[PDB]
Amino acid sequence: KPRIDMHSHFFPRISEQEAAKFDANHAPWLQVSAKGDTGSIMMGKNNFRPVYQALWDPAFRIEEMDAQGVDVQVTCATPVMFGYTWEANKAAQWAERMNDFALEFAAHNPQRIKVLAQVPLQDLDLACKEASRAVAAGHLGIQIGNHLGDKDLDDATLEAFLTHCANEDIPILVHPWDMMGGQRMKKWMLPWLVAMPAETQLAILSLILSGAFERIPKSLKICFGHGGGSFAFLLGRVDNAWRHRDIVREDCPRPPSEYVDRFFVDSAVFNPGALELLVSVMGEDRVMLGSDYPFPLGEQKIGGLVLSSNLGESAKDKIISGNASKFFNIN
Amino acid sequence: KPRIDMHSHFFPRISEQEAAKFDANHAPWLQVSAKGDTGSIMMGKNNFRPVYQALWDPAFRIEEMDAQGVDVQVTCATPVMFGYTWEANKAAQWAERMNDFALEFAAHNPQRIKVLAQVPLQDLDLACKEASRAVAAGHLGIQIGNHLGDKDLDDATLEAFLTHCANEDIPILVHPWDMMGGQRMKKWMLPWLVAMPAETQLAILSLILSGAFERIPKSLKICFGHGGGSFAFLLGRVDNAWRHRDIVREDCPRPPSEYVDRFFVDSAVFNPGALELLVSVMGEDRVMLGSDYPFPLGEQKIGGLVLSSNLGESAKDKIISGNASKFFNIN
Ligand SMILES: O=C(O)c1cc(-c2ccc(F)cc2F)ccc1O
Ligand SMILES: [Zn+2]
């Protein structure tokens, strides 16, 4: 019974240039002190997010994992690195460099630090090419943002990407990014509190109600972050609309709630009643412990909510380790 | 045990000429078909939306209330009537006209049909004086939309309006409308399944995280539709951000979940487990039966989810009737 944290992020140790050989204004880089504990992600010479040392330092992170009791942590790019709005070839070179950084990071201890890759998702060919390349090099899967502008997961290019990954047994973690709401949610981190769970819910519903799950091979292993946003709580309203409105059944021939056997979520819902509902909707085999480490909006005592819950011990063990080791092929 | 449905809408018998008194191009009017069972909302000469008889005909609505077992229904404007983007004086005159149409609609059976008023929310002084005028004239409260373009409920103008209504014991219903993310949600009722719960959550959180609930007198009676949207499920994630980031705390001087004593929600969450969670979060005193009627009835039952639940019979009575009688002052 290891403990696997399958939701965490890292940021590479990349110079101001290097980073400017791709873009001054938009390719991010890492500015670090001599004090060492402190650093910032820089865009050009702007700032952006001060960052904790465990975001970039694998040795420092291993100490934190020991204190938290985490045996293995899956980690992957922070969304600022995605580069989805870039010229496709530049973005594919970026992705390759980023995925090499990730393996370098995990090389500090590959038995305990696993990595997921990013892909140049705005170009299907380059995206599939990089997915297979990165997995052949030791990534256990791919992490993508959930949409490309107005194209959600039901978009043909995105469905085709999931189908490539399914056909090569490449697991997918879907992360919300580029949040809806435009000019509205500008204070108190409302984007993270409102738009992000809606982004994830939209991604799941897009796959379900478009019939995408009818087209995508059952072999796809896909997991959505942050418990799947509000998906589980709003499922009853979805199922009701499907039963009583033929326009909700136009492309989806089964009740939406039956498609929970096609994806996974992590457990980061931050509430005991929420977790129980979530497990009740997804089943104990489809929730995996994830923490959003090392970000402040993550779970501070990793696995605290699952271990202190009232679920059976078989359930707890699946969530903290059994499911993710099967999902990602970890021993 | 008067079964009360406190969440429903209507649209009046507005002729083209009546609407041309305000805006020949943008004031909506109702073109009832010659057969009388369907109609169109119109703007000028253009067809805007097809509508069903129950929307405009109070006598037919009584028929459906009887079939459904609803003894009293609270109704108020459908959002196309709001007029928030209009010049302020025109919008105030329109609001008074609409609020008169509502009283005329309720006059068909005022024991069983109660109404709430609309206000020209784009002008503080005009909005509060119409609020007082309409409540004196017989309205039991106000229904506002949840946002005015990019201005959410934390906007000073809107906070001030709620304070006015708190101070005069004018209850308030918040109806989500003009949904975010529209260019992405054009099939399968996604605006109502995804954007609408988010809109409601955003409205609750904008009052909390801005500290508006701290400055708004506790006398305010305010209710959010559709169970509060995803608010109750995502509250843990909100608390775990308030704990851990200063900027989530800058204007909210207590943990967000402590404000669940400051508002109400209707019971529309379409799922027993989701309802239990909702009552667990809000308490049996702050959930009110509300259906968003008119909708095609079919096999569905207003209040069926609540009555068939496992809550205390005492709790059901509060949800079915007790809470709305106290909230709106009905006997
Ligand atoms: O505490 C914060 O400010 C915070 C920040 C992030 C975050 C940081 C950097 C980045 F490129 C993207 C992010 F979502 C993610 C979560 C979070 O809580
Ligand atoms: Zn994350």
Q: Report the 3 state secondary structure along chain B.
A: CCCEECCEEECCCCCHHHHHCCCCCCCEEEEECCCCCEEEEEECCEEEEEEEHHHCCHHHHHHHHHHHCCCEEEEEECHHHCCCCCCHHHHHHHHHHHHHHHHHHHCCCCCCEEECECCCCCCHHHHHHHHHHHHHCCCCCEEEECCECCECCCCHHHHHHHHHHHHCCCCEEEECCCCCCHHHCCCCCHHHHHHHHHHHHHHHHHHHHCCHHHHCCCCCCEEECHHHCCHHHHHHHHHHHHCCCHHHHCCCCCCHHHHHHCCEEECCCCCHHHHHHHHHHHCCCCEECCCCECCCCCCCCCCHHHHCCCCCHHHHHHHHHHHHHHHHCCC
* Cα separation values, A136 from A20, A40, A104, B186, B311, Å: 28, 32, 15, 39, 54
Of the candidates A254, A218, A261, A226, which has an alpha carbon nearest to the alpha carbon of residue A238? A254
Q: Which ligand is closest in space to the CA of residue A9?
A: 2
Q: Which ligand is closest in space to the CA of residue A268?
A: 2
Q: How far is B165 from chain A (nearest CA, A)?
A: 25
Q: What residues in A contact B187, CB-CB < 8 Å? A: 209-210, 247, 250-251
Of the candidates A153, A49, A145, A140, which has an alpha carbon nearest to the alpha carbon of residue A91? A145
Report residue B173 as tokens. Answer: 């219903």
φ/ψ of residue A51, rounded to 5: -130, 145
Q: What gap in Å lies between CA A15 and CA A101, rounded to an integer?
A: 12
Whole-number Å distance, alpha carbon A295 to ligand 1 midpoint, is 6
Nearest ligand 1 atom to alpha carbon A189:
3
Sign for the pseudo-dihedral over CA of A259, A265, A270, A273: positive
Q: What gap in Å lies between CA B203 and CA B206, rounded to an integer?
A: 5
Q: Do residues A106 and A138 touch, judged by C-beta distance below 8 A?
A: yes
Of the candidates A290, A286, A291, which has an alpha carbon nearest to the alpha carbon of residue A315? A286
Assign residue A211 a region (left: φ > 0; alpha: ψ between -120 and 50; beta: otherwise).
left
Of the candidates A141, A34, A133, A144, which has an alpha carbon nearest to the alpha carbon of residue A83? A144
Measured in angstroms, the resolution is 2.2
Q: How many CB atoms lie within 10 A of CB A315?
A: 18
Of the candidates A173, A161, A113, A164, which has an alpha carbon nearest to the alpha carbon of residue A138? A113
A248 touches chain B (CB under 8 A): yes
Q: What gap in Å lies between CA A133 and CA A118, rounded to an integer?
A: 11
Q: Sheet with B46-52: list strands edge to edge.
A: B28-32, B38-43, B46-52
B185 touches chain A (CB under 8 A): yes
Q: Do residues A72 and A114 touch, judged by C-beta distance below 8 A?
A: yes
Q: Is A177 in the pocket of ligand 1 (CB under 6 A)?
A: no
Q: Do residues B8 and B74 touch, judged by C-beta distance below 8 A?
A: yes
To test the pocket of ligand 1, the residue of A7, A10, A78 to mutate (highest count of ligand atoms within 8 Å of its CB) is A78
Q: What gap in Å lies between CA B209 and CA B211, rounded to an integer?
A: 5
Of the candidates A59, A122, A55, A75, which has an alpha carbon nearest to the alpha carbon of residue A94? A122
Which residues numbered 14-73 in B keep a CB inside 8 Å of some CB on A? Answer: none
Q: SS3 for chain A, per residue?
A: CCCEECCEEECCCCCHHHHCCCCCCCCEEEEECCCCCEEEEEECCCCCCEEEHHHCCHHHHHHHHHHHCCCEEEEEECHHHCCCCCCHHHHHHHHHHHHHHHHHHHHCCCCCEEEEECCCCCCHHHHHHHHHHHHHCCCCEEEEECCECCECCCCHHHHHHHHHHHHCCCCEEEECCCCCCCCCCCCCCHHHHHHHHHHHHHHHHHHHHCCHHHHCCCCCCEEECHHHCCHHHHHHHHHHHHHHCHHHCCCCCCCHHHHHHHCEEECCCCCHHHHHHHHHHHCHHHEECCCCECCCCCCCCCCHHHHCCCCCHHHHHHHHHHHHHHHHCCC
Give yes or no for a cis peptide into A272 (omega within 30° of 0): no
Residues in contact with A35: Cβ distance below 8 Å, sequence separation at least 6, in sequence order: none
Q: Do residues A219 and A261 touch, judged by C-beta distance below 8 A?
A: no
Angle (CA) A201-A212-A219 rounded to 5° is 100
* Cα separation values, A155 from A97, A128, A246, Å: 27, 16, 22
Q: Do residues A260 and A228 touch, judged by C-beta distance below 8 A?
A: no
Q: Which ligand is closest in space to the CA of residue A55?
A: 1
Report residue B153 as tokens. Answer: 């409920």
Interface with chain B: mutation pick from A194, A209, A224, A243, highest number of B CBs within 10 Å: A194
Q: Which chain B residue is nearest to residue A188, measuring alpha carbons?
A: B248
Q: Do residues A80 and A54 touch, judged by C-beta distance below 8 A?
A: no
Report residue A99 as tokens. Answer: 């995925």
Q: What gap in Å lies between CA A330 and CA A112, rounded to an integer?
A: 10
Q: Which chain A residue is nearest to residue B204, measuring alpha carbons?
A: A194
